């Protein structure tokens, strides 16, 4: 189907406690595959998925150098942002960047991304045209002017349309056992008495990949959206995800309620009920 690659980067300054901490991770779809942390002893980019381990030493050397260069650029950029916002050197600040690409089932570029944030707020983003910029404020307009003069958008476009898509396709092939496998949720319904008058029905979805899923409760075929407690999808820690949805039901009315599960790994959407 369709797939994505993303690189995420965070630098956090810490005045009086050395240089900023820099952490970057790379994902294909919902799979972490590389990481770099500046606070490691002799930091290197490290593999986090089995299918990237086969890349040779030249790959790891280049990735590591890019990560060190990015940490250094961020250190300088953090100093610049103190000027742009008239801020003192005493506080901790955050610089984030994400970039990457989406591809369709035929492997062609669907959309590219490159966006930066300061202290948790949008700063400057490359537009979907991969040719113009959206600056959030008058400080980011200074950056925009510099990046227009330096033709940064053209450099990003060339990467996003070329290497980003080409390497994503390589990873999808080398990792086809996992990246191209959807694991359906294992599902079940549990029953939790509240009183002699009511009980909670909780519909569980466990062990699924990728994270996208839809869980809903119906009563007599009508959606219970306003009455459903739906937890945020959460990582199991083994590559897979979990989610549940719960409704409070009158005692004895449990068989009116059906849980409906949609996920890419299912042969067909599921309808489940509580089974005492």
């Amino acid at each position: 189907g369709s797939h994505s690659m993303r690189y995420f980067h965070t630098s956090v300054s810490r005045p009086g406690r050395g240089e900023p901490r820099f952490i970057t991770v790379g994902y294909v779809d919902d799979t972490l595959f590389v990481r770099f942390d500046s606070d490691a002893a002799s930091p290197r980019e490290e593999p986090r998925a089995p299918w990237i381990e086969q890349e040779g030493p030249e790959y790891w050397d280049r990735e590591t150098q890019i990560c060190k260069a990015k940490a250094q650029t961020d250190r300088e950029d953090l100093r610049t942002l103190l000027r742009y916002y008239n801020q003192s050197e005493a506080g901790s600040h955050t610089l984030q960047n994400m970039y990457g690409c989406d591809v369709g089932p035929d492997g062609r570029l669907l959309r590219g991304y490159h966006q930066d944030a300061y202290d948790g707020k949008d700063y400057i983003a490359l537009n979907e045209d991969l040719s113009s910029w959206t600056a959030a404020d008058t400080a980011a307009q200074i950056t925009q002017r510099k990046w227009e003069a330096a033709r940064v958008a053209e450099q990003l476009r060339a990467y996003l349309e070329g290497e980003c898509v080409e390497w994503l396709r390589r990873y999808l092939e080398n990792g086809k056992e996992t990246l191209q496998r959807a694991d359906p949720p294992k599902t079940h319904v549990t029953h939790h008495p509240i009183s002699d008058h009511e009980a909670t029905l909780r519909c569980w979805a466990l062990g699924f990949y990728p994270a996208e899923i839809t869980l809903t409760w119906q009563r007599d075929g009508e959606d219970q959206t306003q009455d459903t407690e739906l937890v945020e999808t959460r990582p199991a820690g083994d590559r897979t995800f979990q989610k549940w949805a719960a409704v409070v039901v009158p005692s004895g009315e449990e068989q009116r309620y059906t849980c409906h599960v949609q996920h890419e790994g299912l042969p067909k959407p599921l309808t489940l009920r509580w089974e005492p």
Binding site: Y7, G26, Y59, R62, E63, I66, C67, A69, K70, T73, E76, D77, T80, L81, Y84, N97, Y99, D116, Y123, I124, T143, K146, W147, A150, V152, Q155, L156, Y159, E163, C164, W167
Partner: peptide
Amino acid sequence: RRKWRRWHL
């Protein structure tokens, strides 16, 4: 694989 960042804010 990554892209070199070659610009400053």
